[PDB]
Amino acid sequence: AEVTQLSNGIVVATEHNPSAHTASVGVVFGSGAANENPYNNGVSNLWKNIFLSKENSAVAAKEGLALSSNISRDFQSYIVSSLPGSTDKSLDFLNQSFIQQKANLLSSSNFEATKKSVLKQVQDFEENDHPNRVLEHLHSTAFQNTPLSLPTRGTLESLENLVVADLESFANNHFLNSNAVVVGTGNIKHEDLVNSIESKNLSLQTGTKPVLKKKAAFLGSEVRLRDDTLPKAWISLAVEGEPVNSPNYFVAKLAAQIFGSYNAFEPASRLQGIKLLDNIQEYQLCDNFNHFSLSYKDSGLWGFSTATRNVTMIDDLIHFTLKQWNRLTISVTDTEVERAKSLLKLQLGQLYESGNPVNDANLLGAEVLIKGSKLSLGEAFKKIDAITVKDVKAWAGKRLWDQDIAIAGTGQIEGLLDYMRIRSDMSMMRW
Amino acid sequence: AEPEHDERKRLGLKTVIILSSLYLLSIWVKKFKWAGIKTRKFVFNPPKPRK
Ligand SMILES: CCCCCCCCCCCCCCCCCC(=O)O[C@@H](COC(=O)CCCCCCCCCCCCCCC)COP(=O)(O)OC[C@H](O)CO
């Protein structure tokens, strides 16, 4: 496995892997949910559904290929999987889809059907999925009045205020030749390297992406969605993280991995880990853990999430988690760091070793749209091994000791102290 | 009748100075840490009609 790079007007990337036999080729745009004003929120989701809606029959009829999509914060990706010997067909279909012509794909009936389907889907998401809801609310409350807080699926009222003008405007303003790459993950050697760059076989509308007046921000805002009908209580915490291409990415990832995950209803999860697991097992407080270290091109979010059937025990859980975070920055045994390093090595190996071509293409585009070339796994392992106790202690002291935090919650949140009791528990303790 | 007037007034001046400083300090801190609770806003969205 190796990475190649080249450019003429556009950028072309490829990570050949002859072991797998599922070639996937598609484009990736560096403009998603972070490049849209709050009055135009679900335009990217409408694009995704309108490319997943109607021509999905044509792709399976005329040829054989399964087409996917993904929008996370700015990486609007349209991957077209295929068989190893049928990549040119996928590229030709992608060209006939984007560059010419999208007028047929933009009709009144098709758009109305996509609109009602998207409305039903977003309503269902807002009804059922609670942890994702609290994650989106944490994002929307940490980045108040900033093009990084609005959700990636579109607020309910924002959908029905845009039909054909906003969608085409987004296409003409973001689907450009400056922030687009052509991934080639699979088992293709050099056809992607040559056919992507042609006299006219590239996206039209040469130009530049509009600049953003506001880069990012982070203020400690609290949001609650108290409602006693739900049985459980989902709460999330976060602090300021680091963006991609910073010499703190892997240290933050290791700090997240130190505490790891947990699941009380699994016999293999109650007997491992670090101290807070032991402190929690004595009384049934929590059910799930998710120590996440998210990073975006502007700013990151290193946080925590949980969900408890017990409602009176929320304060104790939050206090114990904050106390453990406090202990992280003063005294960590070298054994803890070694175990966290091994666990993170395994985790990144699983993440970057999965046989899915689509996930590898997504990661490749994500890491190439910011730096220019993907950071290989061997170098990643070497620099992971470079980390020591001093570096993680320094990062924890810099980014955790008495820093502004954001909180979110929903369900039975009657027993959650609002903002000063939680914030005070990071420096009031004897040090 | 009161052989402590000078000492009483000196101690009283010191006491009123220190208590005035403490009172202003408490004013500032109370207006500070109540700022996050005196500004929180509520929005009522009627729930969907299904018990
Ligand atoms: C007008 C009414 C009051 C009149 C006067 C009252 C007189 C009695 C005073 C009783 C104690 C109140 C004085 C101030 C207490 C500070 C708060 C405190 O100690 O309690 C915290 C307890 O804090 C701790 O448990 C950690 C800090 C203590 C560890 C460090 C100790 C240092 C040395 C202490 C010496 C004193 C020992 C006796 C303390 C009672 C609670 O907050 P928390 O950090 O637990 O946050 C809440 C969280 O969500 C749930 O935990």
Q: Which of A153, A300, A158, A145 is nearest to A212 (CA)?
A: A145
Residues of A in contact with B36 (CB under 8 A): 418-420
Angle between helix A334-353 and A389-399 (nearest 10): 80
Alpha helices in A7-164 (DSSP H): 43-53, 56-62, 87-98, 108-127, 130-142, 156-159
Q: What is the DSSP letter of A181?
A: E
Between the two ends of chain B, the Cα-to-Cα distance in Å is: 81
Angle between helix A314-328 and A249-259 (nearest 10): 130
- Determine, for residues B33 and A419 on separate chains, whether the beta-carbon distance falls below 8 Å: no
Residue count of chain B, please give it.
Answer: 51
Q: Is A27 exposed, middle or buried (0-12, 13-18, 19+ CB in 10 A)?
A: buried
d(CA A17, CA A374): 15
Angle between helix A334-353 and A249-259 (nearest 10): 110
Written as six digits, the tokens of A11 are 């950028």
Task: Indicate left, alpha or beta for A128 from its phi (over 0: left) and psi (-120 to 50: alpha).
Answer: alpha
Angle between helix A165-174 and A43-53 (nearest 10): 90
Q: Residue A182: beta bridge partners?
A: A12, A27
Q: Is residue A37 within 8 Å of A149, Cβ to Cβ?
A: no
Question: Is some CB atom of chain A closer than 8 A to the CB atom of B46?
Answer: no
Q: Which of A195, A167, A7, A176 is nearest to A99 (CA)?
A: A176
Resolution of the experimentally solved model in angstroms: 3.3
Q: Determine the distance separating the centroid of ligand 1 and the alpha carbon of A429, expressed in angstroms.
A: 9
Written as six digits, the tokens of A269 are 């999860």
Whether A430 lines ligand 1, by a CB cut-off of 6 Å, is yes
d(CA A227, CA A237): 19
Is the four-CA dihedral A202, A68, A376, A374 of positive or negative sign? positive
Q: Residue A175: beta bridge partners?
A: none
Q: Is residue A180 within 8 Å of A11, Cβ to Cβ?
A: yes
Closest residue (by CA) to atom 44 of ligand 1?
A: A425
Written as six digits, the tokens of A168 are 């085409």
Residues of B in contact with A222 (CB under 8 A): 40
Among B40, B43, B45, B51, which would you mutate to test the A interface (most chain A Cβ atoms within 10 Å of its Cβ)?
B40
Which single residue is written with the structure tokens 């450009």? A176
CB atoms within 10 A of CB A114: 20
For residue A3, what is the enclosing H or E element?
A: strand A2-8
Q: Is A186 exposed, middle or buried (0-12, 13-18, 19+ CB in 10 A)?
A: buried
Residues of B in contact with A417 (CB under 8 A): none
Question: Residue B32: closest CA among chain A residues belongs to which residue?
Answer: A420
What total of structural domains would you count in chain B? 1
d(CA B6, CA A101): 97
d(CA A423, CA B10): 43
d(CA A325, CA A291): 11
d(CA A382, CA A375): 11
**Helix, strand, or coil (residue A214):** coil
- Nearest CA of chain A to the CA of B28: how many Å? 16
Whether A319 lines ligand 1, by a CB cut-off of 6 Å, is yes
CB atoms within 10 A of CB A262: 22
Q: Which of A259, A380, A392 is nearest to A324 (CA)?
A: A259
Angle between helix A357-368 and A334-353 (nearest 10): 110
d(CA A86, CA A93): 11
**Helix, strand, or coil (residue B48):** coil
Q: What angle do CA A18, A22, A24 make, to 5 degrees?
A: 105
Q: What angle do CA A144, A178, A80 make, to 5 degrees?
A: 90
- Nearest CA of chain A to the CA of B38: how many Å? 12
Breaks (C-N over 2.5 A) in chain B follow: none
> For residue A190, which amino acid is it?
H
d(CA A149, CA A216): 9
d(CA A271, CA A251): 26
Q: Please report the DSSP string for A215-235 in residue order.
A: -------EEEEE-TTSSSEEE
Question: Is some CB atom of chain B closer than 8 A to the CB atom of A418?
Answer: yes
Residue count of chain A, please give it.
Answer: 431
- Nearest CA of chain A to the CA of B50: how many Å? 12
Q: Which atom of ligand 1 is nearest to the CA of A425?
A: 44
Q: Is residue A177 within 8 Å of A203, Cβ to Cβ?
A: yes
Structural domain including B25 reads 4-51
Question: Residue A123: closest CA among chain B residues belongs to which residue?
Answer: B48
d(CA A252, CA A273): 18
d(CA A384, CA A388): 9
Which of A319, A323, A330, A426 has most ligand 1 atoms within 8 Å of its beta carbon, as the pocket-test mutant? A319
d(CA A234, CA A216): 26
Q: How far is CA B42 from CA A150, A154, A226, A233, in A?
A: 20, 22, 11, 20
Question: Is some CB atom of chain A closer than 8 A to the CB atom of B36?
Answer: yes
Q: Residue A295: beta bridge partners?
A: A300
Question: Is some CB atom of chain B closer than 8 A to the CB atom of A157?
Answer: no
Determination technique for this PDB entry? cryo-EM
Q: What is the DSSP letter of A70?
A: B
Question: Residue B45: closest CA among chain A residues belongs to which residue?
Answer: A225
Between the two ends of chain A, the Cα-to-Cα distance in Å is: 49
Q: Determine the distance separating the centroid of ligand 1 and the alpha carbon of A416, expressed in angstroms.
A: 18
d(CA A303, CA A407): 10
Written as six digits, the tokens of A193 are 């390297």
d(CA A238, CA B43): 24
d(CA A239, CA A263): 23
